[PDB]
Amino acid sequence: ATKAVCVLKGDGPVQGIINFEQKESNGPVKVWGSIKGLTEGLHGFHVHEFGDNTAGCTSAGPHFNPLSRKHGGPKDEERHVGDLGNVTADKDGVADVSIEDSVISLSGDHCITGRTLVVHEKADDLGKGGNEESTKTGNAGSRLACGVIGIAQ
């Protein structure tokens, strides 16, 4: 198996740890871990193009989109490679993450390693919000925490 990991940090209280595992080349990737310090509800959760945190999470650029598609949810055909939907926090501010995704990879042109995972201020509308920005960013707002996805042991 191939493994990767991301430590999420930002300027405020949001912090988390996310693990990735891919049993087979071109097979699905399991994504799991925890994020704390969040407001209750949905928070957009995406891989962004650049693994650049120079000036904070903004430096990571747009959603990772090697196929030049429109934004969607993880269960949509029309999506960016980086579109992992939302994490959902309870009243304690904790989101338990447990995702399987077949579009991201840990090798090849869909590889997310060396790119940035971001958790956002607001819900991602999964491209169903009915404005122009819905099919670009999902209207998920600012970036609360992020980290560069690294190769794991």
- Site of interaction with Cu ion (CB under 5 A): 46, 118
Listed ranges 7-15, 83-91, 97-105, 111-119: which one lies at the site for Zn ion (CB under 5 A) = 83-91
Among 36, 50, 88, 129, binds a second copy (CB under 8 A): 50
Min dist CB 10 to a second copy, Å, is: 13
- Whose Cβ is closer to a second copy: residue 15's or residue 134's? 15
Q: Which structure tokens are listed for 146? A: 């992020």
Residue keyed to tokens 């980086």: 82
Shortest separation between residue 5's beta carbon and ligand LDP, angstroms: 14
Q: Is 43 annotated as a binding residue?
A: no
Nearest to 6 by CA among 152, 149, 151, 153: 149
120, 144 contact by CB (below 8 A): yes
**Residue 27: closest CA among 112, 82, 101, 88:** 101
Tell the smallest beta-carbon distance from residue 61 to a second copy (Å).
6
Catalytic residues: 46, 48, 63, 71, 80, 83, 120, 143
What distance in Å separates the CA atoms of residue 25 and residue 66, rounded to the nearest whole number? 18
State yes or no: residue 148 binds a second copy (CB under 8 A).
yes
Measure the CA–CA gap between 126 and 124, rounded to whole angstroms: 5
Specify which residues 19 forms β-bridges with. Answer: 5, 32
**Helix H or strand E segment including 29:** strand 29-36
Q: Binding-site residues, please?
A: 46, 48, 63, 71, 80, 83, 120
Please report, as ranges, the residues that interact with ligand LDP according to CB under 6 A.
21-23, 27-30, 100
Please report, as ranges, the residues that interact with a second copy according to CB under 8 A.
4-5, 7, 17, 49-54, 61, 113-116, 147-153
